[PDB]
Ligand binder design. Structure first.
Ligand code: CYC
Ligand code: 3CX
Ligand code: NA
Ligand code: NA
Ligand code: NA
Ligand code: NA
Length: 159
């Protein structure tokens, strides 16, 4: 499953040639965290930045039990500076040098399980429909892989 994440994250990064790809997973209370990353050589890994560069707290998704994702909606942002985010949100994005990004839902069964994010640093992006569609397909495949990893867990407890 780590294998799966690594595999998925590297694929998205190479297919989109973006700076960073992240996998987010929700906890039962809709808190969550980034559990996997694929990142280009030029940037420091997320966990390392988190040990040194503090952020504004962000409980939005938790307070809203998944927000737009829960309704199968995605976020596609060509330019974060132009998007109209709250100041704290934009400040967080800017802390990670994120200038354009995509975030899509990952569903495991009919349950919102997490998110798949793709980030471009330093310059805006004109995202294309096929890039978004491809990310959704990869997110669906990830969801299936997780769903079946679960199924196989349930199987091996039951013997
Ligand atoms: C300012 C911070 C207010 C706020 C705004 C806000 N945030 C989101 C959505 C997201 N915020 C995050 C951020 C994190 N996830 C993490 O694991 C970490 C630690 C490194 C951070 C900083 C993420 C992943 C999301 C989902 C993707 C996105 O960037 O939008 C929203 C929803 C925006 C929308 O329209 O969908 C909003 C409004 N959060 C707060 O708590 C402050 C009041
Ligand atoms: O739209 S929702 O009700 O999910 C939540 C609300 O926080 C919207 N975020 C704005 C949307 C437009 C881009 C800037 C950020
Ligand atoms: Na949040
Ligand atoms: Na969002
Ligand atoms: Na915002
Ligand atoms: Na299945």
């Amino acid at each position: 499953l780590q294998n799966i994440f690594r595999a998925t994250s590297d694929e998205v990064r190479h297919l989109l040639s973006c700076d960073r790809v992240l996998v987010y997973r929700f906890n039962p209370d809709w808190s969550g965290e980034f559990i996997h990353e694929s990142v280009a050589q030029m940037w420091e890994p997320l966990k390392d930045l988190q040990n040194n560069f503090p952020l504004w707290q962000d409980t939005y998704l938790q307070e809203n039990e998944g927000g737009r994702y829960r309704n199968h909606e995605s976020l596609a942002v060509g330019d974060v500076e132009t998007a109209g985010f709250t100041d704290c949100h934009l400040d967080n994005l800017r802390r990670f040098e994120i200038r354009a990004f995509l975030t899509v839902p990952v569903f495991v069964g009919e349950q919102l399980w997490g998110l798949l994010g793709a980030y471009q640093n330093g310059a805006p992006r004109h995202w294309q429909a096929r890039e978004i569609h491809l990310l959704h397909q990869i997110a669906n495949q990830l969801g299936v892989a997780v769903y079946q990893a679960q199924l196989l867990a349930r199987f091996q407890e039951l013997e």
